[PDB]
Design an enzyme around this catalytic site. Structure first.
Site, PDB file in Angstrom:
ATOM      1  N   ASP A 207     -31.668 -13.720  -4.938  1.00 44.28           N
ATOM      2  CA  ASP A 207     -32.720 -13.062  -5.701  1.00 44.28           C
ATOM      3  C   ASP A 207     -33.275 -14.032  -6.733  1.00 44.28           C
ATOM      4  OD1 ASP A 207     -32.295 -10.789  -4.219  1.00 44.28           O
ATOM      5  OD2 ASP A 207     -31.612  -9.552  -5.895  1.00 44.28           O
TER       6      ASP A 207
ATOM      7  N   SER B  13     -39.704  -8.946  -2.784  1.00 46.48           N
ATOM      8  CA  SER B  13     -39.376  -9.036  -1.358  1.00 46.48           C
ATOM      9  C   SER B  13     -40.665  -8.956  -0.549  1.00 46.48           C
ATOM     10  CB  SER B  13     -38.338  -7.962  -1.039  1.00 46.48           C
ATOM     11  OG  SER B  13     -37.225  -8.055  -1.904  1.00 46.48           O
ATOM     12  N   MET B  14     -40.783  -8.036   0.409  1.00 44.93           N
ATOM     13  CA  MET B  14     -42.003  -7.928   1.199  1.00 44.93           C
ATOM     14  C   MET B  14     -43.214  -7.662   0.322  1.00 44.93           C
ATOM     15  SD  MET B  14     -42.464  -8.821   4.048  1.00 44.93           S
ATOM     16  CE  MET B  14     -43.625  -8.804   5.388  1.00 44.93           C
TER      17      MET B  14
ATOM     18  N   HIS C 157     -36.733 -13.314  -2.123  1.00 44.05           N
ATOM     19  CA  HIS C 157     -35.365 -13.440  -1.644  1.00 44.05           C
ATOM     20  C   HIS C 157     -35.387 -13.416  -0.123  1.00 44.05           C
ATOM     21  CE1 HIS C 157     -34.303  -8.820  -1.429  1.00 44.05           C
ATOM     22  NE2 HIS C 157     -35.351  -9.143  -0.693  1.00 44.05           N
TER      23      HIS C 157
ATOM     24  N   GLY D 111     -39.542  -3.478   1.377  1.00 39.44           N
ATOM     25  CA  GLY D 111     -39.218  -2.517   2.405  1.00 39.44           C
ATOM     26  C   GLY D 111     -39.157  -3.195   3.769  1.00 39.44           C
TER      27      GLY D 111
END
Lengths: 178, 181, 179, 181, 184, 180, 182, 180, 180, 179, 179
Positions: G161, G87-88, G112, G58
């Site tokens: 990714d 991700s985060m 990523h 997010g």
């Protein structure tokens, strides 16, 4: 629009205007004009102006294969923008007769697509688009003189080239000067 | 909805009963995982009962439930009522060996994972390799929990495969068809 | 809605469960949870299941059906207003001798509904599945009404509306509850 | 909305055996009314029940769930029309205990034939048209029993929207008394 | 929204304990259902003390308004009406429905009277039925309004043919209220 | 949102009312009810009305206005951030000597807004009504600020933004509340 | 959803110093996580905190609100990846106390490059590009320090990714241990 | 778009028909009308059908197929760009020996697509119908390519992409048209 | 689309060929009826050729075509290409006896008419009676044009009934399967 | 569509095709064709084919009054369906020259409309549509021979008529049989 | 709209009307008209009227390069408004032959665009539009005589110029006074 229309006026001089996205309808018109111009004269050159952001790969190959098949030489002249399949068609002109105006823009990148559904279906769609890129890079390599791995790395992301850089790359033969 | 003050599901959770009755997403997995961890803290030895009526959902959310079931000490019994499809049938086969059940008219469906990909050819290749590797992980574990070979599971999940409760027992997805008591 | 608990929680205290909506997974979870809770409270006393439903998911209805058949207490079914499709199936699922309908309640039976989209092979799989589901439904309906399987098959080919009295004649209920 | 333990205003009226029907009649509303009727009978099968009706109508089958429950329970159910009792709402107004059906002086009562729809093959439209025709005859039959009007007159007076004052509703037999201040 | 210490109330439930009812929205079946229940509840609690109905309403359903109207007239306690801000359409009708001598409006409150609104669709007979119904609904409204204001039925008809906006003082002159409530 | 009661009910215990939104019938219904409740609690102690509002319904605002003028307790008005349109009208409605604005708060006055559709006579009725409403607003604004009616009329012809200091000179407030 | 005798299921776990991050990371979620961390420190500034992570990622700034709060408080924050940390979410997974970062055997970790958008004049586009490039460098620098990998390796491994198993995530340095059934 | 006639009518004058869109009833109506017209003008000269199509309606495609098989002139098929699904079926429908594809053209074969909703009996009828349509499609494709039905069935279970050279080995075309 | 000045359909109409290649609605019925009346005015003796590729549509629009075919003097040959479903198969069977054809892979589907009804019970009864009479009218004519009994037509149209071209000849819907 | 277009070719033979809903645009076109055919020849008959579900009453009266006004006889031929205003125009043809094909359908019913606003505005709209219905029924009575009361009762709901019933009713003169 | 159409009749006098936003369709038409007029006569002047709010930079460069490539002089006449790429094409006319009517407006600003995706993609798009601005400012500097730094400062925000100011700036050569 103005009145033939202006494009029919140019077609009498063997000039074809590709100035939109490449879909099946556009390719149908371009291919029909190429076949018609060859039937009128299989010897005189054809002039294909290209101002396109790209589009369908198969529709572009319909134009590509028709260019390569007919007897007349097809000159390509890039005005404004030739991106993706459009820059592919620009490089598809008769060797020595591929042009871009000094401020025209050329962009090359790898093809885009989509896949949805089962894992097996996603695999089939991925294999197909990977083969399509491989076909595009092989042809791009023979028409520009660059190596295939050179095409692969230079098309991994959006790669914008000026008219002069496109000549350096081998996508065009001459920057058409005023 | 009804109140017992508890709602009916919190009242059942007091008896170490967890209700899985929806699609599996991150929110559902969080609640199930939280309920599993809570029940282990209450008593790490008594069995837990996981009722499953699910059409499936996120594979990663389902693995959060799977790995939490495998990690905690209490045995987790799985009872399929109505429907255990896709990741739902995967969690059904994840119950404690000998304690995996389905009601006589419950239905079990297994198939290969679903997904999507859009963008550059490189991005589609990455997504395809990932979902193909995800399916291999699912089939390997399914092989371990059912006793079927990996190639057989691959063949049986190529399309939607619906099984009755008895066929699910023959296949190894459950241990017993709960007959009316 | 009103508070006494809400009116449904107050009735659940008397072992009364209200089925008054379409049958989906969420409704089936609540009904099953209430049934399991009532058996844990007392495995002897009867349970009363009121049914006013236009039907819904077949698998969600079978989650309720199999739970009724599994628990120890008898489950009485009382149809008020309408028991159609999976709703009439659950009405016939009550304890034999304790399946009821009020005089003006309506009972409708028909074959299952579904959909299929995609390749011919996928449509075949979906067709085989819904055909197998219908056979399973008709077989159980046959055992609980006393009608033959072919009779159930012919009478559910189209929407078949029954009065409460006709539902007793058919074997879907045992008695019309008179005032 | 207002609060009066802590109850809302409707729960407070429910303690006095007063039920408020002040919305369209669907399955949810019928669930609430029927449950309140069963609840009030269990608390006391002797004292009257008071059903206030302000409804434009709604589902016929949901309305029959309320109708049959009224007829079945032991306590008398008084019906009081406030504002408007239209369609299934006027049917339930006439369903109160004989002698205990009321309407306030400026309340309105509307009767008409039931509404429905049909789609598909000719056989399916025939089945649906037949079903709604049986439903109207069932409604008119009972309405004939509850008002004293003939079945033929009910059919003629419900062919289209028929608006009645409180006095006309008493003259017709839908209510027994106009409740004066 | 706010909560009042006592058990716990919202601001409206606390005011209901002092026999104050707030009508501050459009008049629909839900609002009428709530007002009627509060009136019946207050009468059961005490059949002699007055009830205070504050009215800030643009109007709404006519039949829902009569559900409130008839309940006011039926119960034993006097219902005082106090218009704050706006009493329009059925709202001005309910304002005029308070106990004679106990109908009020604040100095800058607004009162609007007009003929009822509606719609009709379908066959000519169906439109005729709907036209007759709303025409009879207006006559019933004008009949009662004449009785509660002292104006003639013909005057009510003429003054409600279009939107008729009245100040608080004009509403007292018209007979819709009894007194303009001045700052105490 | 936070619980102490919620934060607003806790402030209401100290006779503080928070107007921090557009003014519609719901907000006015709540504010009026809180005013009547506080008067019933104690008809002598002051009430504090914080105002951060872009305005809203004129009739909803007058329900608040008339309730303020009617009750026995003084109602202090405190503008934080912005008091525009009916909000600045309510700001000027506070007890004389007890109308405040914080130093960077903004006050905006303008003529009322509305609409009309239909027959020419119906448009005439709606235009007369909104013209009478503005005359009422300007009349009261003249009495509460000391400005002439003609001055109020031209100063509300368009959006007129005032600082806290300009609002005190104009007569909309009595004091600019400086940090204590 | 469920209620527990003594709470909702999450409030009951919070008493045992367990925080559940099982959704996308936005300002509201980060606001709640940060508040729970501060509350647990006020309860006891010494005992460990357990942060379960099942998140697709997010907002980067919302994640840095969580990250900086983890690094600032006195208690160690253990991170446990269940299902997916992308991700985060995988960044916060690597942000746990060294030696107390875990993933369940079939959990997935994805890393990523950050995502964003820009619209308007060329200068506005330039400002937005420079900012997102500094944001990526900040993420990769911290990721390098917490995993032991070189920054250029982080840069190439996050260009697209990149999906990792739990075992590969331990090998990479994103976690310390694959949490096996006890 | 351009005028010469429009570009397509001028090519029809040389007995050239352009199929360059999805196949529906309207497109099939146009293709069929052009085929009957070209036969009426001259029942001996070949007809040239260029195909750049993603497929479409199976019944619409069979309207084109049966007209090709029925008329006297040979119909040459030339695939440019893409012949997928019913489009690749029509590509294989050309006169034996006169079915072509350009070197970079793509040919895709798969099983037919459809949908069904309603009663179980209605889903059964729709499933049987699409299963019979696939069997009809495979039989004809077997006759026109030389592949067995079982091979056609397995190769069309999912999307099967073929190059021009692979399509010629498969029997869908006779020659890969090389530049002249 | 293509031009021959004529469009391709006007050129075929000059040879007494009418193309029905769409759903049957009032607009299509207007064109077909107009072409039928025009061709009879041109020559009341020569046959007319009606190609049919239609999924069906409005029953009354189809009867406008049906009655015009039966009324005019010239024989109307019907040729099914691709699909003749619902009212489309009704018009196929309406051609001059002995001159009703289908191409080998064309499909023919028969079923009962479809409709809808909304409103009062009496209005639903009127719509139900109307569609029931329409079906009996369709079955009565279908029996006369195929030789099948009405009880057989009724049972064979209760659900979607798909027929191959050869089965359509066996049934009596066509006279000949037009072979290459 | 086919090429003049096919309708213009029929217009030279004094044939007018009404095969759509009746709105102002359609009525305008039909009126123009009627006036045009009278100017070319005021003696030879005009042929008006009707396949219409109805539509606007005022647009239909624009066609009706033009038919009644021009000198040539206007023959009406119903093909497929003449419903509502379409059956009104079918009955408007020259007496003796109103036809329907054997399987054509004729439907008659009362006019449809809407009303919104104040009670007075709804009263005006109801009075207007009631006068429109009596005007339609009065003319229908003059053209069919039926009494006004019979028209009122037969148009209270949708009334579907076969071609034979329409000739029996007086809406047409002959069922045009296959020559 | 009026009838050749009015634009083709003006094109017969070597007059081209640019009276819309500049997109690929417009640029394609303008370029074709320019090539057509050169083929008609490579010597006589061409007149390009400009009333445009701007548009695509690549579409504008297609027109720009075609003006620069053909042999005939292209006169530019600004009527109403020449904004963004429209003011760029206005400055692209033959030196000495760039005009604006007295009340015409000229606006210059930096290019507009967007970017979405990964940071690298955003970096590529940012670098590209920055190169595009430098190319635009370089040519604008070449055609007006102003320095590159001044053009950069004067295009940072929307800059509106009167016709007189545009000649002062060097974007046009003359303010066309009424004849």
């Amino acid at each position: 629009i103005p009145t033939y229309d202006i494009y029919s006026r140019l077609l009498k001089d063997r000039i074809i205007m590709l100035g939109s996205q490449i879909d099946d309808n556009v390719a149908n018109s371009i291919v029909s004009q190429l076949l018609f111009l060859q039937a009128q004269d299989s010897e005189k050159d054809i002039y294909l102006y290209i101002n396109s952001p790209g589009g369908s790969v198969t529709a572009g190959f319909a134009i590509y294969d028709t260019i390569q098949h007919i007897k007349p030489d097809v000159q390509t002249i890039c005005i404004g923008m030739a991106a993706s399949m459009g820059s592919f068609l620009l490089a598809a002109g008769a060797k020595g007769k591929r042009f871009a105006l000094p401020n025209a823009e050329v962009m090359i990148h790898q093809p885009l697509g989509g896949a949805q559904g089962q894992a097996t279906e996603i695999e089939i769609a991925a294999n197909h688009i990977l083969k399509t890129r491989e076909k595009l890079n092989r042809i791009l390599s023979e028409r520009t003189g660059q190596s295939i791995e050179k095409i692969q790395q230079d098309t991994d992301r959006d790669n914008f080239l000026t008219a002069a850089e496109a000549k350096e790359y081998g996508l065009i033969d001459e920057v058409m000067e005023p």
